[PDB]
Structure 1
Amino acid sequence: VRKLKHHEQKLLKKVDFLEWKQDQGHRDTQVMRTYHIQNREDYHKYNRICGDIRRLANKLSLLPPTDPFRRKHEQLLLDKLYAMGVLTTKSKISDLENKVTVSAICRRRLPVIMHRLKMAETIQDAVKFIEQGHVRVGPNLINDPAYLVTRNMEDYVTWVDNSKIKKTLLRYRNQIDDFDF
């Protein structure tokens, strides 16, 4: 629509064809762009998990502070998330409500972890390599760019043995050994 004149704007203050309140600020698209998610419902599946963690954290909070059950379950929930890598630190219990976010789960996706491990220059580039079958976690080749890598599994992410990518790395350093391949 053309830029509204002064008198039209006053009579049409709330009209917005491109931003609605139910969109929640397009937090959907923004997080998808940063981490290059391809399935439009992957954010909302992550969100529903984040909500359930937050629901339990509240229900634990309302329980009395000295209760052994409260302390036990909260510690278990902190360790589990930290092991997954969603939570960077296990110290403060407020992190369950403040620092549990969809972006936290997204950052553990295989495309991003390669980018942090510098196996790729960019997230978009790293996604292409997964779809090309160059990336393995352990001895299993992975073509799904939504593989959530736990902290312990992050050590086993590596190129495939015969990948052309692996040959360029060794060739660039003049360390290519053709017996291995």
Structure 2
Amino acid sequence: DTQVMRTYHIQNREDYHKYNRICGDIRRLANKLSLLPPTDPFRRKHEQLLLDKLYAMGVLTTKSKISDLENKVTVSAICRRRLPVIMHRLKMAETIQDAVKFIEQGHVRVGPNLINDPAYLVTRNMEDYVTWV
């Protein structure tokens, strides 16, 4: 909890409070669709409709299963979707804080656009476009 804020170096505690509700939106939606008889094609199709969005959202990086919706959906999966967290992974940066300061004084170019927002969210598929200056 507190150290998760410390490890991810989040600007605000309410930002953690946002994504728990955003996880809470998915989680009760994960509940109510699961509270159906197994013979329903409405049930079987629409679980897959929800999953196939969340792959390209980058929350489900690997290919996942039905029960992993209760499991793999965390706030930290959303916390990894932040811009400098993605920036540290592909190893053009050097530390966590180095990824911060380059967004601060503006050395990161995602595709054709200049971005200096620290709360920028990165998907699974748009990540090939981060360029230098």
Q: TM-score range by the shorter chain?
A: over 0.9
- State yes or no: 1:34 paired with 2:7: yes
C-alpha separation in 2, matches of 1:137 and 1:62: 42
Residue 31 (structure 1) shift: 1.6
Q: Deviations over 1:73-99 (max 9, x none)?
A: 111111111111111334311111111
The alignment partner of 2:122 has SS state of: coil
Q: Deviations over 1:38-66 (max 9, x none)?
A: 12211111111111111111101111112
Query: Any unmatched runs of 5+ in structure 2?
Result: none
**TM-score using structure 2 length:** 0.93
C-alpha separation in 1, matches of 2:15 and 2:54: 19
The alignment yields a C-alpha RMSD, in angstroms, of 1.2
- State yes or no: 1:54 paired with 2:27: yes
- Find runs of 4+ consecutive structure 1 residues off by over 2 angstroms: 88-91
C-alpha separation in 2, matches of 1:90 and 1:55: 22
Q: Deviations over 1:126-179 (max 9, x none)?
A: 01111111011111111111111111110101212xxxxxxxxxxxxxxxxxxx
- State yes or no: 1:140 paired with 2:116: no
2:91 counterpart residue number:
118
Size of the aligned set, in residue pairs, is: 133
Q: 2:61 touches 2:124 (CA, 8 Å); kept in 1? A: no
The alignment partner of 2:13 has SS state of: coil
C-alpha separation in 2, matches of 1:118 and 1:71: 40
The alignment partner of 1:41 has SS state of: helix
C-alpha separation in 2, matches of 1:80 and 1:36: 28
Larger Rg computed on CA atoms: 1
**TM-score using structure 1 length:** 0.70
C-alpha separation in 2, matches of 1:90 and 1:52: 22
C-alpha separation in 1, matches of 2:64 and 2:57: 16
C-alpha separation in 2, matches of 1:62 and 1:76: 17
Q: 1:133 touches 1:142 (CA, 8 Å); kept in 2? A: yes
Q: 1:78 touches 1:90 (CA, 8 Å); kept in 2? A: no
C-alpha separation in 2, matches of 1:63 and 1:82: 24
C-alpha separation in 2, matches of 1:82 and 1:48: 20
